[PDB]
Write a protein that binds this ligand. Structure first.
Ligand SMILES: CCC1=C(C)/C(=C/C2=NC(=C\c3[nH]c(/C=C4\NC(=O)[C@H](C)[C@H]4CC)c(C)c3CCC(=O)O)/C(CCC(=O)O)=C2C)NC1=O
Ligand SMILES: CCC1=C(C)/C(=C/C2=NC(=C\c3[nH]c(/C=C4\NC(=O)[C@H](C)[C@H]4CC)c(C)c3CCC(=O)O)/C(CCC(=O)O)=C2C)NC1=O
Ligand SMILES: CCC1=C(C)/C(=C/C2=NC(=C\c3[nH]c(/C=C4\NC(=O)[C@H](C)[C@H]4CC)c(C)c3CCC(=O)O)/C(CCC(=O)O)=C2C)NC1=O
Ligand SMILES: CCC1=C(C)/C(=C/C2=NC(=C\c3[nH]c(/C=C4\NC(=O)[C@H](C)[C@H]4CC)c(C)c3CCC(=O)O)/C(CCC(=O)O)=C2C)NC1=O
Ligand SMILES: CCC1=C(C)/C(=C/C2=NC(=C\c3[nH]c(/C=C4\NC(=O)[C@H](C)[C@H]4CC)c(C)c3CCC(=O)O)/C(CCC(=O)O)=C2C)NC1=O
Ligand SMILES: CCC1=C(C)/C(=C/C2=NC(=C\c3[nH]c(/C=C4\NC(=O)[C@H](C)[C@H]4CC)c(C)c3CCC(=O)O)/C(CCC(=O)O)=C2C)NC1=O
Ligand SMILES: CCC1=C(C)/C(=C/C2=NC(=C\c3[nH]c(/C=C4\NC(=O)[C@H](C)[C@H]4CC)c(C)c3CCC(=O)O)/C(CCC(=O)O)=C2C)NC1=O
Ligand SMILES: CCC1=C(C)/C(=C/C2=NC(=C\c3[nH]c(/C=C4\NC(=O)[C@H](C)[C@H]4CC)c(C)c3CCC(=O)O)/C(CCC(=O)O)=C2C)NC1=O
Ligand SMILES: CCC1=C(C)/C(=C/C2=NC(=C\c3[nH]c(/C=C4\NC(=O)[C@H](C)[C@H]4CC)c(C)c3CCC(=O)O)/C(CCC(=O)O)=C2C)NC1=O
Ligand SMILES: CCC1=C(C)/C(=C/C2=NC(=C\c3[nH]c(/C=C4\NC(=O)[C@H](C)[C@H]4CC)c(C)c3CCC(=O)O)/C(CCC(=O)O)=C2C)NC1=O
Ligand SMILES: CCC1=C(C)/C(=C/C2=NC(=C\c3[nH]c(/C=C4\NC(=O)[C@H](C)[C@H]4CC)c(C)c3CCC(=O)O)/C(CCC(=O)O)=C2C)NC1=O
Ligand SMILES: CCC1=C(C)/C(=C/C2=NC(=C\c3[nH]c(/C=C4\NC(=O)[C@H](C)[C@H]4CC)c(C)c3CCC(=O)O)/C(CCC(=O)O)=C2C)NC1=O
Ligand SMILES: CCC1=C(C)/C(=C/C2=NC(=C\c3[nH]c(/C=C4\NC(=O)[C@H](C)[C@H]4CC)c(C)c3CCC(=O)O)/C(CCC(=O)O)=C2C)NC1=O
Lengths: 193, 274, 172, 162, 172, 162, 162
């Protein structure tokens, strides 16, 4: 079942309660780290304090969490660069990648400008702005046909979403691999980008 | 996004920006029509220097209008310190002046009337100072003389709108902010039909002026303290009017002589007719 | 971000010049005292929790209004925010102390802070005091530690103080 | 696992960048420091047995009531699991000494500490007092930069528990 | 991420043990040779561009099909991608060389790489060769540099080679 | 501005964390290495100009058509702006030496380099050849770890331009 | 691949929208323009041989030194790879003419250009001078709107290289 995603984003409806803010914080951690347990000592207490003070929006809180060393240890240092890109599309945009060009552009940006500029490229994208805005937590989208999509994104986002008990968890013996095929990735486009 | 802490992360110069957004950047996820929150009509966000060009381009495209850019670190040091001016030092000119008693007065009238801009020595009104020294005129009399002078006309009137002139006039001549939208209007109509000179007289022959300054007292600040028949919001206008000891009236600003009191703000204190 | 060397470099560049023999030796001295500096930063890190805790106990000992209803360190949520801010400021003071320059403290922590607190209704004078208490205890630790070689750390204790004093001044 | 080496490499990688003089200078620190670190490590390693028994006892001497019946310092299994736990801490301290960073402590003891201690009714105070004692005795096994290193990591654990 | 020490630690922990005197001295030796290691990593960093360029010139000298239409290093876009990959691999090999462990190379670069190239139609045997050429030139530089103290770097040259050889094997 | 000190502080801050033994070990590297760095700095500082005139000329000797009329190594202003530019590079090299990292080079010469050079029709080849020459002569002004440092930064500029 | 047709379709698709009168008007431009474009294409196509040899030589005549030994305009292989490269440019110019947009140029020559040229020590100046020459001669092979089209695309390449 992916009963759960059709989605319903959560947010900071101007004048948020501490209970709604704690629900937003719990939702952002569940989305960015999957179903993986995070110890209370491992939480980015500085970024939570900035969001409590209303000094940052939900977009900037997601930026601070994705730039945190905890995200680098779990997803960047334990997986291959192509599997990292698949997971960053999953966590920040709620979708699979559309074509093999997006991977080459993201791999080339990462090689030229490093990790932090690659994270900013997803968050400053017009796709992030158009569909999450500033106050919505990231959520899974690949179950709705979206405008200007590629029908193969549904199947790929299903392959990336092993269900509400799955773990993009970096321990599975083999450890961090890949899940969308390069051959199947190539159907939908292939270009001498 | 509002009022900020800090400046930079890796290092930057944070600028805080302010705009007016369409439902194109921010909308609710509701069933109909796209709307942004009514209270974020003009919204502000602080962005470090690199992301800045990209942000402004985006905002302008999707419809917003930039209202301002100003460095964050300018804007972190609060509001002015007002201790020097909550309660000032009064300067008053006695009947038989002492030769330097009168020296005290002139330096102060200058500072206060001209709003702390430099008046260079070529610039000073010497013939008029001659008059005060001999007692032919009094301190209020002299104060009126500076206002009708070209130097006053030139740094404060000729290059700004009437809204601004009158707002400066209240600050200089009366020491207090302008209380109502009616005050602005009542004055603009006078200038229009009796000229500049009649209009200048109207602050110096007023009952309010006469009570506080009398005739031998140099006009001094008095709007940081509660006054009579003053709306309550005129005490926040005073912060907008006076920017600190080192601030001044200055017509030499890059952007020119402009306002300082929002027109919207004035209306909050009441709107009628005439 | 600046450190004490980077600061030198920026001033030199504004002249269009290679660093002056003046500036060179000022920096040679910073390298000379750097082991002491590392111990001083280590003194704070190694006792961060107690420095905050002890400052705290004493702040509320003095200002019992903050822990009454109506007070800015009541209920648990607000006390946790106040304890958190004590840590944040102690943290940026230690960064400045490793750097030999206040800029990280001023730019990432102190800039806008006063206006934040006023917007919040947080009594800045109480926050200034909490910073003064952290200073007392932090320096205590810088001066009396575990089996460090005996010598004179007063220059560094002063410099640490000015970072605590910057923060206090900026906030009150 | 956080070491000076992994940290500089992480920072290079994330900017898509070869290691440069900034990063190699950093690494030299970690390598120059290894001698003091590893002396602390060897001393803590061979004294482990007694450091553990010393700290275990001190937990009971400072919290006398723990050793009465119905309490958590009573019976072979509690007292056994205690020695083990302090031994875990000393073990990771030696690892952190040898590794050139807090990584081993961060990954194997700090991540999750409070949740575990809270579910199992384990008071940090005991563990702080175990470590305070270990810190007292390590004063005379080491000196100079090996002692400073030992201290750095013991104190790091005490702050993790406060 | 692992380095050579971290690796030791993980194996020790899986025994439930403090590091063996065996493992201790193996690591003491790594510290012993660390200045040489820094020079070796520095040799690669200091000539990265030429190492990639020279490998490249030679790859296309041998395989003139890649630069014909139909070829995987044609047109400019593809050549830039190929030049970029040469840099990426040389980069993770240098990281492994600073670390004394291949893991960063295997985990962040080599894992999945072959299957990526096959999906793309990128000829893996040509990529393997480009890696072999980078190895030749990189080691060239490790062995013959600017005023480094004379000694024996063959142990480090071997280890660097195995990182180049891991990558080649993993990809072909 | 990238130095060992700023890097470790940045890494602490971004995890909301006090500086720990990992970060202080790193800093000790930077401080231990200051002596060699600063000796290189003093030698490069006092023996300075001629390096610029030597490299400027070598650009014309290697690209003869350069010093001919209608070309960009001709007339007082081109040749003046050239000396200045190499002087800028040596200046930032000394700054990077003194600072303990590439920051000064990254912020004042590398960021924007290609865009500027491309708009103004300045070939990197000249600048590489200026630097290759400076590297040749610095072989006999320094030795040991001061030379390695000088080299590190000269080479860093050459890679920035390729 | 960017053409008027693909652009309007892309813009429709991205708004989830059928092509409307705005988009069909646009397409008519591209179709009305085909005659001039394709005349330029045929002229550039049959003169290709000589346009290429003319521009190749002009690179050596403007940069005489290139043809001396030890240089990059010397030996059969350099001079061969040069002719080829200019031929690539003219080829994509004809494609862009025929296609109704810059797509072929953007995808096959512009994307990646600088990185490649920088790794291989190829100066854009040569290529600009090849193209400036091709532009001179195409002045008398075409006129009117076919010349304007040829010019549009030649100039587009020159701006891509500056
Ligand atoms: C939808 C609700 C939901 C569930 C049920 C869930 C399970 C889940 N358990 C996980 C890990 C884990 N689960 C356990 C559980 C156990 N270890 C044992 O030895 C015991 C037999 C057992 C406890 C009874 C452990 C130890 C890990 C960490 C594995 C590792 O990282 O090595 C992970 C990987 C991500 C992470 O570590 O946070 C997921 C997704 N996640 C979810 O979101
Ligand atoms: C960059 C590092 C950093 C600092 C320094 C920081 C300060 C900071 N302190 C805050 C609140 C606070 N700070 C305090 C502190 C105090 N209350 C008192 O009465 C005492 C005088 C003082 C403790 C000594 C309190 C009570 C609040 C909550 C105010 C409120 O919500 O009403 C907030 C608003 C967000 C939040 O509540 O989490 C920020 C941003 N934030 C940061 O990210
Ligand atoms: C984790 C670090 C990392 C690596 C190693 C990486 C490899 C990688 N190489 C790619 C493409 C490529 N790689 C090459 C490489 C070559 N072509 C040849 O003919 C030669 C044999 C070889 C050069 C030696 C080419 C030509 C492409 C483009 C393929 C295409 O789009 O048609 C792509 C697709 C995305 C893109 O084009 O940017 C990835 C992900 N990406 C990464 O993030
Ligand atoms: C928090 C809940 C909430 C409110 C209350 C809200 C008000 C609101 N009304 C708006 C526009 C508007 N509101 C009206 C309303 C009227 N026009 C008239 O002539 C009548 C007098 C009146 C209807 C009775 C109109 C016409 C606009 C569009 C103005 C324009 O774009 O020109 C906008 C600008 C964004 C948009 O157009 O979607 C906001 C934010 N937005 C919110 O999120
Ligand atoms: C309307 C234009 C105008 C005139 C004409 C004028 C005259 C005038 N001359 C004055 C003083 C003076 N005038 C003089 C002039 C002189 N002393 C001598 O011994 C000479 C004989 C003579 C110069 C030729 C002196 C010395 C004083 C100062 C008297 C004092 O304060 O003791 C004063 C007293 C105020 C002052 O000192 O500034 C006036 C009003 N004021 C005016 O506004
Ligand atoms: C610097 C020279 C200068 C200008 C240009 C100026 C404009 C100006 N026009 C004003 C009012 C006004 N202006 C108008 C004008 C109009 N009403 C309409 O419906 C028409 C569209 C338009 C006439 C064409 C009206 C009706 C008011 C009075 C608004 C009110 O009080 O409700 C006011 C407010 C003060 C007052 O009412 O006297 C200013 C300052 N003031 C100046 O000193
Ligand atoms: C338009 C009519 C009008 C109002 C309403 C008004 C309010 C007003 N109250 C003020 C001060 C003040 N108001 C208070 C009032 C209080 N302190 C407390 O603790 C209590 C909660 C409260 C009394 C119930 C205090 C203590 C100050 C002085 C603040 C200071 O200077 O520190 C000031 C600053 C100027 C001054 O101190 O005179 C204004 C303008 N002013 C006006 O002209
Ligand atoms: C509270 C005490 C106090 C201070 C400190 C003060 C500063 C001050 N300096 C000003 C102007 C100025 N200040 C300068 C100063 C400089 N120009 C340079 O190039 C140098 C870098 C620098 C001299 C070291 C200049 C040139 C202006 C005139 C700007 C203009 O009108 O274009 C002005 C505008 C008013 C005027 O021009 O008189 C103020 C208010 N005013 C005060 O009342
Ligand atoms: C892991 C990072 C790191 C640290 C922390 C470090 C500390 C360190 N502190 C040292 C000295 C010292 N440290 C101090 C510090 C103090 N003296 C006092 O009496 C005060 C209580 C305290 C003031 C801060 C003194 C006086 C010396 C001896 C003089 C000197 O070497 O400058 C030395 C030189 C060797 C020695 O004499 O013991 C080192 C290596 N080195 C490092 O690599
Ligand atoms: C790898 C690092 C690591 C640590 C640090 C660790 C701590 C730890 N201590 C535990 C239990 C325990 N810990 C103690 C501790 C003590 N009892 C006493 O006599 C003293 C008061 C005190 C020693 C100071 C006791 C009594 C238990 C049994 C708790 C229970 O199951 O009721 C458990 C529960 C699983 C078990 O029963 O073994 C964990 C996970 N586990 C780890 O894997
Ligand atoms: C900025 C980071 C950094 C670097 C790069 C560094 C290098 C460095 N290399 C050294 C030695 C050396 N380096 C080499 C390296 C080589 N010998 C050869 O013949 C080969 C061509 C090359 C193989 C890699 C050798 C043989 C020694 C002397 C033996 C030794 O100290 O181990 C030394 C000891 C002092 C000396 O003898 O010169 C240092 C400090 N130190 C640092 O802090
Ligand atoms: C802070 C670091 C920094 C650097 C590195 C820098 C480079 C630089 N070189 C420039 C010009 C120049 N650069 C040169 C260089 C040379 N001419 C020759 O004789 C030789 C071939 C060569 C020296 C090797 C020439 C001739 C110009 C003038 C270009 C023009 O305006 O036409 C310009 C344009 C502005 C100007 O005309 O000064 C910049 C910005 N600017 C900076 O701010
Ligand atoms: C599809 C579009 C496309 C373009 C435009 C292209 C350019 C291009 N030119 C190259 C080489 C070259 N380009 C030249 C160019 C010249 N030599 C001279 O005599 C003149 C100065 C100049 C001609 C004006 C030279 C000499 C080389 C050999 C560079 C080398 O490998 O050393 C290479 C390297 C691969 C190879 O050696 O063939 C590419 C990719 N490749 C493409 O796929």
């Amino acid at each position: 079942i992916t009963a759960v995603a059709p989605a319903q984003a959560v947010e900071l409806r101007p004048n948020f309660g501490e209970t709604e803010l704690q629900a937003v914080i719990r939702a952002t951690y569940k989305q960015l780290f999957g179903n993986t347990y995070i110890l209370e000592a491992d939480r980015v207490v500085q970024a939570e304090s900035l969001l409590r003070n209303g000094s940052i929006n939900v977009r900037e809180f997601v930026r601070l969490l994705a730039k945190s060393e905890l995200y680098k240890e779990r997803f960047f240092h334990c997986t291959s660069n192509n599997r990292f890109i698949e997971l960053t599309f999953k966590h920040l945009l709620g979708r699979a990648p559309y074509n093999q060009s997006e991977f080459v552009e993201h791999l080339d940006r990462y090689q030229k400008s490093g990790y932090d500029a690659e994270i900013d490229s997803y968050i400053d994208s017009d796709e992030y702005r158009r569909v999450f805005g500033e106050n919505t937590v990231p959520y899974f989208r690949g179950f709705k046909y979206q405008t200007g999509q590629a029908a193969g994104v549904f199947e790929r986002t299903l392959k990336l979403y092993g269900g509400d008990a799955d773990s993009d968890t970096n321990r599975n013996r083999q450890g961090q691999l890949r899940q969308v095929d390069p051959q199947e990735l190539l159907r939908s486009g292939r270009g001498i980008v | 996004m509002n009022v900020l802490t800090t400046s930079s992360q890796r290092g930057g110069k944070l600028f805080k920006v302010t705009m007016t957004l369409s439902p194109a950047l921010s909308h609710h996820p509701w069933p109909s029509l796209d709307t942004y929150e009514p209270s974020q009509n003009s919204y502000s966000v602080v962005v470090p220097l690199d992301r800045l060009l990209a942000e402004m381009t985006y905002i302008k495209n999707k419809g917003g209008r930039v209202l301002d850019i100003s460095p964050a670190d300018l804007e972190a040091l609060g509001p002015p310190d007002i201790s020097s001016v909550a309660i000032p030092l009064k300067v008053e000119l006695w009947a038989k002046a002492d030769v330097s008693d009168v020296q005290a007065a002139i330096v102060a009238a200058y500072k206060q009337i001209f709003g702390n801009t430099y008046v260079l020595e070529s610039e000073r009104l010497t013939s008029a100072e001659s008059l005060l020294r001999n007692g032919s005129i009094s301190v209020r009399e002299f104060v009126r003389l500076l206002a009708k002078s070209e130097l006053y006309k030139e740094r404060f009137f000729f290059c700004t709108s009437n809204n601004r002139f009158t707002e400066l006039n209240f600050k200089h001549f009366l020491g207090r902010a302008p209380y109502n939208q009616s005050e602005i209007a009542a004055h603009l109509d006078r200038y229009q039909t009796f000229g500049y000179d009649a209009e200048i007289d109207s602050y110096i022959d007023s009952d309010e002026y006469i009570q506080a300054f009398g005739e031998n007292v140099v006009p001094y600040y008095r709007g940081f303290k509660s006054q009579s028949g003053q709306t309550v919001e005129s005490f926040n206008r005073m912060f907008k009017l006076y920017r600190g000891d080192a601030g001044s009236d200055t017509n030499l600003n890059l952007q020119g002589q402009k306002r300082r009191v929002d027109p919207k703000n004035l209306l909050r204190s009441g709107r009628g007719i005439v | 971000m600046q450190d004490a060397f980077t600061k030198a470099i920026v001033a030199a560049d504004l002249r269009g010049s290679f660093l002056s023999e003046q500036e060179l030796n000022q920096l040679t001295n910073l390298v000379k005292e750097s082991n002491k500096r590392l111990d001083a930063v280590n003194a704070i890190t190694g006792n961060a929790a107690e420095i905050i805790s002890d400052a705290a106990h004493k702040l509320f000992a003095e200002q019992t209004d903050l822990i009454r209803p109506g007070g800015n360190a009541y209920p648990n949520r607000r006390m946790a925010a106040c304890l958190r801010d004590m840590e944040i400021i102690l943290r940026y003071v230690s960064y400045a102390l490793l750097a030999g320059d206040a800029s990280v403290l001023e730019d990432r922590c102190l800039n806008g802070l006063k206006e934040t607190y006023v917007a919040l209704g947080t009594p800045t004078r109480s926050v200034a005091r909490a910073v003064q208490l952290m200073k007392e205890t932090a320096i205590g630790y810088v001066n009396s530690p575990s089996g460090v070689t005996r010598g004179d750390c007063s220059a560094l204790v002063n410099e640490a103080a000015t970072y605590f004093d910057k923060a206090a001044a900026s906030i009150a | 696992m956080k070491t000076v080496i992994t940290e500089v490499i992480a920072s290079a990688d994330s900017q898509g960048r070869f290691l440069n003089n900034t990063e190699l200078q950093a690494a030299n620190g970690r390598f120059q420091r290894a001698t003091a670190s590893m002396e602390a490590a060897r001393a803590l390693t061979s004294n482990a047995d007694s450091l553990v028994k010393g700290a275990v006892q001190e937990v009971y001497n400072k919290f006398p009531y723990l050793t009465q019946p119905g309490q958590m310092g009573y019976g072979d299994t509690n007292q056994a699991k205690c020695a083990r736990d302090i031994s875990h801490y000393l073990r990771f301290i030696t690892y952190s000494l040898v590794a050139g960073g807090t990584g081993p402590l961060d990954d194997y003891i700090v991540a999750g500490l409070r949740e575990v201690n809270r579910t199992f009714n384990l008071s940090p105070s005991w563990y702080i007092e175990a470590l305070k004692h270990i810190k007292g005795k390590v004063g005379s096994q080491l000196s100079g930069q090996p002692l400073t290193e030992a201290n750095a990591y013991i104190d790091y654990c005490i702050n993790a528990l406060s």
